[PDB]
Enzyme design. Structure first.
Site, short mmCIF file in Angstrom:
data_model
loop_
_atom_site.label_atom_id
_atom_site.label_comp_id
_atom_site.label_asym_id
_atom_site.label_seq_id
_atom_site.Cartn_x
_atom_site.Cartn_y
_atom_site.Cartn_z
N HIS A 170 -10.92 47.19 -36.49
CA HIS A 170 -11.08 47.41 -35.08
C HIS A 170 -9.81 48.08 -34.52
CE1 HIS A 170 -11.97 46.53 -30.86
NE2 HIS A 170 -13.13 45.99 -31.18
N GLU A 240 -20.67 41.32 -33.52
CA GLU A 240 -19.32 41.50 -34.10
C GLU A 240 -18.65 40.20 -34.50
OE1 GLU A 240 -15.63 42.98 -31.65
OE2 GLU A 240 -16.40 44.66 -32.77
C1 LIG Z 1 -4.19 43.11 -26.75
C2 LIG Z 1 -5.15 44.15 -27.26
C3 LIG Z 1 -5.35 45.05 -26.06
C4 LIG Z 1 -6.14 46.31 -26.51
C5 LIG Z 1 -7.66 46.07 -26.47
C6 LIG Z 1 -8.42 47.32 -26.91
C7 LIG Z 1 -9.70 46.94 -27.70
C8 LIG Z 1 -10.70 46.28 -26.84
O1 LIG Z 1 -11.98 46.74 -27.36
C9 LIG Z 1 -13.05 45.80 -27.25
O2 LIG Z 1 -12.83 44.77 -28.18
C10 LIG Z 1 -13.80 43.73 -28.15
C11 LIG Z 1 -13.43 42.62 -29.11
O3 LIG Z 1 -12.24 42.02 -28.60
C12 LIG Z 1 -15.13 44.29 -28.54
O4 LIG Z 1 -15.12 44.78 -29.93
C13 LIG Z 1 -15.47 45.41 -27.58
O5 LIG Z 1 -16.71 46.01 -27.92
C14 LIG Z 1 -14.37 46.47 -27.61
O6 LIG Z 1 -14.69 47.45 -26.63
C15 LIG Z 1 -15.26 48.63 -27.15
O7 LIG Z 1 -14.33 49.30 -28.00
C16 LIG Z 1 -13.15 49.75 -27.31
C17 LIG Z 1 -12.19 50.36 -28.32
C18 LIG Z 1 -13.54 50.73 -26.20
O8 LIG Z 1 -14.15 51.90 -26.72
C19 LIG Z 1 -14.50 50.05 -25.24
O9 LIG Z 1 -14.87 50.97 -24.23
C20 LIG Z 1 -15.71 49.55 -26.00
O10 LIG Z 1 -16.48 48.80 -25.12
#
Ligand SMILES: CCCCCCCCO[C@@H]1O[C@H](CO)[C@H](O)[C@H](O)[C@H]1O[C@@H]1O[C@@H](C)[C@@H](O)[C@@H](O)[C@@H]1O
Ligand SMILES: C[C@@H](N)C(=O)NC[C@H]1O[C@@H](n2ccc(=O)[nH]c2=O)[C@H](O)[C@@H]1O
EC number: 2.4.1.40
Length: 281
Positions: A170, A240
């Protein structure tokens, strides 16, 4: 089948490929970053097996709008030179755009029900993928790649990913400690992982493997979700969360770097990413 003679640079034992990132897991699965693979060798290996790759995508309700760019960019970057079968799951078969495909590439439209809640649309992908493994995928492809539709390919995604079972790091958590991972933390859920467990936080938006292993994963996740439903609980990150529980207990045979699942708007372009291959729209 024997490889033909090929001329390429000698691998150097005393020069690591990447000095900045982990390129193998502690269970000896490759972690796929640019610089770790010679695509010419891998292409030869997979062409000699006449490999066919299936790509599943769900385009339910308004998410049909994403298909045109998804499919056009896949034509440019996804398994080019290999046999590919796109499987488009949709509640609107007439809304699938007519995308021109390269030779040896086909698309099938699979009509499915639309659930009202987006959480259920997301979650029920596991049931639907598993049901279609049960006949269609088994006979038609060797590998299955299961992805989100609201994405585009920007760079090469090829046979380097192929393996019995893979997950993808991720993009929000590849640098985080396991305590910070957003696993499901309620023991009442089948997806529960405690704070002292976990290898990686895998993205629900990109996984795959052999048809047999994907059938196992998707069946296991759907059954876990059904147990949770009967117990009146829904995992924090839905499918997920169950994917992560599955991959903790059944280790993937390759892990894909965040090159393969990225959001440039939210996260920029770090130096550790030499390519952005598959990105949020
Ligand atoms: C401290 C970290 C701070 C940084 C955080 C950045 C990642 C957050 O990400 C979200 O993570 C969630 C799980 O915890 C889900 O997988 C969600 O679908 C995802 O959002 C998706 O993927 C993302 C990458 C974006 O594209 C968002 O628009 C999507 O909805
Ligand atoms: C996080 C981001 N990729 C997302 O919004 N949804 C996960 C996927 O599930 C599918 N989906 C979700 C809600 C919906 O109404 N339609 C749909 O196809 C799409 O394939 C989406 O890509």
């Amino acid at each position: 089948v024997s490889l033909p003679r090929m001329v390429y640079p000698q691998p150097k034992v005393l020069t690591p490929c990447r000095k900045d990132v982990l390129v193998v897991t502690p269970w000896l699965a490759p972690i796929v970053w640019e610089g770790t693979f010679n695509i010419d060798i891998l292409n030869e290996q997979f062409r000699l097996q006449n490999t066919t790759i299936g790509l599943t995508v769900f385009a339910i309700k308004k998410y049909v709008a994403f298909l045109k760019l998804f499919l056009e960019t896949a034509e440019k970057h996804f398994m080019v030179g290999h046999r590919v079968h796109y499987y488009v799951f949709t509640d609107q078969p007439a809304a699938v755009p007519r995308v021109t495909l390269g030779t040896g590439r086909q698309l099938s439209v699979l009509e499915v029900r639309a659930y009202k809640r987006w959480q259920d649309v997301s979650m029920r992908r596991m049931e639907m993928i598993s049901d279609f493994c049960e006949r269609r995928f088994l006979s038609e492809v060797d590998y299955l790649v299961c992805v989100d539709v609201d994405m585009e390919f920007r760079d090469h995604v090829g046979v380097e990913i192929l393996t019995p079972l893979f997950g993808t790091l991720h993009p929000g958590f590849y640098g985080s400690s396991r305590e910070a991972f957003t696993y499901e933390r309620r023991p009442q859920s089948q997806a529960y992982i405690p704070k002292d467990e976990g290898d990686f936080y895998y993205g629900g938006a990109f996984f795959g493997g052999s048809v047999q292993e994907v059938q196992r994963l998707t069946r296991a996740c759907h059954q876990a979700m059904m147990v949770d439903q009967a117990n009146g609980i829904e995992a924090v990150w839905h499918d997920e969360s169950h994917l992560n529980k599955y991959l903790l207990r059944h280790k993937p045979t390759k892990v894909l770097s965040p090159e393969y699942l990225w959001d440039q708007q939210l996260l920029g372009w770090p130096a550790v990413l030499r390519k952005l291959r598959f990105t949020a729209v």
